[PDB]
């Protein structure tokens, strides 16, 4: 349904790990930036749920990645603002479940994220802390 606590959710259940599948899901979600804070919350809860698998989390990671990236592209802070905070949870918790290979894909997401500063440095650090807490190891720079 429109603007329901389910529209974006059903998208997650029909994503594909490809440029256009993510692009179509992204451009749509981008049209309803009104839902940015809500979708960020539902997105995290959907990824943190025990009823989701690594692929659905990889799909969700790619969707939000394109969304927040393209959002900064046209300065739609509502997305990157909301998604950023919940990102540290998701990316950091799925980091504890993703095999080394999907985790590598996420590692790039976390890299390009802070390299381009799609979120605030605090959010960047919170994501890094979450990944770090998964193996209890750290670095002298952020």
């Amino acid at each position: 349904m429109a603007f329901s606590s389910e529209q974006f959710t059903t998208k997650l259940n029909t994503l594909e790990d490809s440029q256009e599948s993510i692009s179509s899901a992204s451009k749509w979600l981008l049209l309803q930036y009104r839902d940015a804070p809500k979708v960020a919350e539902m997105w995290k809860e959907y990824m943190l749920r025990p009823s989701v698998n690594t692929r659905r989390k990889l799909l969700g990671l790619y969707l939000m990645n394109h969304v927040v990236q393209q959002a900064k592209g046209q300065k739609i802070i509502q997305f990157q603002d909301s998604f950023g905070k919940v990102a540290a949870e998701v990316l950091g918790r799925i980091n504890q479940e993703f095999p080394r290979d999907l985790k590598k894909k996420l590692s790039r997401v976390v890299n390009i994220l802070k390299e381009r500063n799609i979120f605030s440095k605090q959010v960047v650090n919170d994501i890094e802390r979450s990944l770090a807490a998964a193996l209890e190891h750290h670095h002298h720079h952020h």
Binding site: E16, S18, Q19, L61, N65, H66, K72, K75
Partner: peptide
Amino acid sequence: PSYSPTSPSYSPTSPS
């Protein structure tokens, strides 16, 4: 699958 966790999309930072 074919998506890039990098993407060519980006824009300079600005307060507005």
